[PDB]
Design a binder for this molecule. Structure first.
Ligand SMILES: [Gd]
Ligand SMILES: [Gd]
Ligand SMILES: [Gd]
Ligand SMILES: [Gd]
Length: 324
């Protein structure tokens, strides 16, 4: 699934473009638009993968429905393309005939982006298409996205809030076993040029298939824990489900622990796969308080009931579990 992973990187950077535009571009910034933006990103990934790999389109699941409601109360089925003009005519039904906003989105949705890791072009791993399911969280950390803080100082490499906490989560899992095989995390807002206002992004991929474990090149640099801003259970507050998982991937945090039932398969799947590829993973917190990995094939519905612990090292985990 190296050719599938390489294609999931492209659409994630295409998703990042849509995430950046709706903050950067000023027509869209003024403007429920977030739910629209989520479905639009979710439908871009769904169709592009269907296009390049026929049969995967019906195996791509996500946080949002493909159906939205406008101010008139009409229910619209969000199907993009094939031409740019049809997407304008579809979005103008949802945004109350707002042509400036409809033309703006459609231009980014139909924008050919060429994002490729040459490291992944070298590797030739094949995974049967028939055993693959995909979980998608289009733009994670809704609150931090809409507020849009670009001026927050990180506490020891970890941003407590701000646009850095926003991530595009695309996970791929085995349908039969439920084990996450591949995962892509895209930070659309990492570094801003103060003068030009332009945001530079960063993507992270990982593969774990039948003992073959490869991941993206990670930048250099007792225990360092990262909890959510609402967590009421050296500890760090950090916003965004995806970002807190990325902190464990980047080594900024040793453990990410979430107690509540308000995380879902699409929040964790992408990170879990990348963590698996570095010899880590995610366990059920409640089952550990009585190593059971999170599954992504069976429901309960698609919430991680009993919380989760995200770990990079299995030794770091055992130490943390000994204290708790
Ligand atoms: Gd290939
Ligand atoms: Gd959403
Ligand atoms: Gd389609
Ligand atoms: Gd989320």
């Amino acid at each position: 699934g190296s050719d599938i992973l390489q294609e999931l990187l492209r659409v994630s950077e295409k998703a990042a473009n849509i995430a950046r535009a709706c903050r950067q571009q000023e027509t869209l910034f003024q403007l429920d638009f977030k739910t629209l933006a989520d479905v639009l990103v979710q439908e871009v990934i769904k169709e592009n993968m269907e296009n390049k790999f026929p049969g995967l389109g019906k195996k791509i699941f996500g946080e949002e429905s493909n159906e939205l409601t406008n101010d008139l109360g009409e229910k619209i089925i969000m199907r993009l393309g094939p031409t740019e003009e049809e997407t304008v005519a579809l979005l103008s039904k949802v945004l109350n005939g707002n042509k400036l906003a409809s033309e703006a989105l459609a231009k980014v949705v139909h924008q050919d982006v060429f994002f490729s890791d040459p490291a992944l072009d070298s590797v030739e791993i094949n995974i049967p298409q028939d055993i693959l399911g995909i979980w998608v969280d289009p733009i994670d950390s809704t609150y931090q996205y809409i507020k849009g803080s670009a001026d927050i100082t990180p506490n020891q490499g970890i941003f407590p809030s701000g646009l850095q906490c926003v991530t595009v989560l695309i996970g791929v899992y085995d349908i039969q076993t439920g084990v996450p095989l591949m995962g892509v995390i895209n930070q659309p807002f990492v570094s801003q040029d103060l003068h030009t206002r332009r945001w530079k992004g960063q993507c992270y991929w990982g593969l774990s298939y039948l003992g073959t474990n490869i991941h993206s090149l990670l930048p250099p640099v007792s225990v360092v824990i990262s909890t959510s801003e609402k967590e009421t259970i050296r500890i760090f507050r950090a916003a965004g489900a995806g970002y807190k998982s990325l902190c464990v991937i980047l080594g900024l945090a040793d453990i990410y622990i979430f107690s509540e039932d308000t995380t879902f398969k699409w929040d964790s799947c992408a990170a879990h796969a990348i963590l698996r590829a570095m010899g880590g993973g995610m366990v059920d917190l409640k089952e550990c308080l009585e190593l059971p990995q999170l599954v992504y094939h069976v429901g309960n519905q698609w919430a991680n009931k009993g919380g989760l612990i995200a770990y990079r090292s299995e030794k770091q985990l055992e130490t943390f579990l000994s204290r708790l």
